[PDB]
Ligand binder design. Structure first.
Ligand code: NA
Ligand code: NA
Ligand SMILES: [Zn+2]
Ligand SMILES: [Zn+2]
Ligand SMILES: [Zn+2]
Ligand SMILES: [Zn+2]
Ligand SMILES: [Zn+2]
Ligand SMILES: [Zn+2]
Ligand SMILES: [Zn+2]
Ligand SMILES: [Zn+2]
Ligand SMILES: [Zn+2]
Ligand SMILES: [Zn+2]
Lengths: 242, 242
């Protein structure tokens, strides 16, 4: 078989895969792009051999699926990353935050940990020893300003920037446009090594990781043409991980 | 203070609370309805004293929030319940399912357990001893037909009914309309005691559960007028739990 079914969720992932599909066809392979509209479907597909791979998540998100489903997905190639950050409409820096400030963070566990790791790295709070990227609010062990962490859906974080009683909010570069911002406006920015931890990955089953199909897929997704697209199409926000 | 802030997500919950708001006003209380658009916000609000109560979830869903946040929410009054069920476009009953059938179940843990409990109760599969309503696919210990469980977003379950390679799918009565069905068409229907386990509840903080505000709220949400609305507005699908 010379067909490679890759499941994706975002239009951006589909568009990246369309570039790869051009290249793979020159090597005798047909990439079929399976489009899905929720964050489980692309993993279900690969788990059940309904897709050969997916391009939709970072490794930490994948590992949550494996643990829940006792599945065997592996990340085989990082493609791009971006910088999480905190944004404050009224304050210049994190030292200025008011006592009992409310701070907006993502409501889902993976992104909560990502946001809290940035605060921990910057001394805003201290997390319990060793929790790393898996911290939750309950792991806060020092909170000098008595910050209240407001758990906010990813989709509502940009709006929370303008909310009067929210001192600062976590956001991703994709969501900064309507609010009039870039990562240049961030008062705390995720360091590059942490962003690479969350790079979007090509994912497949463990047993398939060395197959010819996956080799062709990796090779077609890591060319100059893909790197240039990633940068251009994201307006500089997504950084190629190769 | 004579104001009661109740957070809700669904328009149906808001409409039920508007009836209650009429009654509470006659007892000297003003109910403020806080509308939210995701499944965390209503719990965050009550956790942080931003709302006095919420009306949006069942107790099992609430208990997941408590465990994650080390929070202290309690369910104080069930309001209505409905029957989960399985629906099959091509088969009359569950004994007829083909070998290696694909069966659609909800992709989120709480609803996965609810769906699997129905299969377990009806002998379609057997779950590991004692998992009750918290089963996952990994807890299946007997699977005579070698069913593959397709993990499908709640919003996509009704469509999966018409999917050629899906033998049967779990669905809720709210989602049956476009597909042309009622619970009468169910080939397996959740028993009443299990549906009551998942009754939508009035929820508050433990420390507030005996307060005058919560007493007035419970009383205003459990009248004849509310029961009739629940039944009429749902076209018979929601059954009052009082
Ligand atoms: Na607020
Ligand atoms: Na299918
Ligand atoms: Zn496009
Ligand atoms: Zn080439
Ligand atoms: Zn809050
Ligand atoms: Zn790492
Ligand atoms: Zn490189
Ligand atoms: Zn209405
Ligand atoms: Zn009365
Ligand atoms: Zn599947
Ligand atoms: Zn029960
Ligand atoms: Zn009664």
């Amino acid at each position: 078989d010379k067909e490679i079914t890759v499941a994706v969720q975002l239009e951006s992932s589909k568009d990246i895969l369309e570039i790869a599909k051009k290249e793979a066809e020159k090597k005798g392979y047909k990439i079929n792009i399976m489009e899905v509209s929720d964050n489980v479907a692309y993993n279900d597909a690969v788990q059940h051999d309904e897709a050969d791979a997916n391009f939709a998540q970072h490794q930490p998100f994948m590992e949550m699926f494996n643990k829940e489903k006792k599945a065997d997905l592996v990340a085989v190639q990082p493609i791009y990353y971006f910088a999480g950050g905190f944004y404050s409409k009224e304050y210049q820096d994190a030292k200025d935050l008011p006592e009992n400030a409310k701070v907006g963070i993502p409501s889902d566990p993976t992104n909560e940990g990502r946001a809290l790791a940035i605060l921990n790295a910057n001394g805003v709070i201290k997390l319990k020893e060793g929790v790393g990227f898996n911290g939750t609010v309950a792991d806060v062990v020092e909170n000098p300003k008595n910050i209240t962490f407001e758990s906010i859906d990813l989709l509502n974080l940009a709006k929370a920037y303008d909310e009067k009683d929210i001192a600062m909010v976590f956001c991703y570069p994709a969501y900064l446009e309507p609010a009039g911002l870039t990562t240049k406006d961030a008062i705390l920015l995720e360091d590059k090594e942490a962003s690479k931890h969350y790079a979007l990955q090509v994912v497949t089953r463990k047993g398939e990781k060395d197959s010819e199909k996956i080799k062709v897929l990796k090779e077609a997704m890591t060319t100059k043409e893909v790197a240039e697209y990633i940068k251009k199409n994201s307006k500089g926000a997504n950084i190629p991980a190769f």
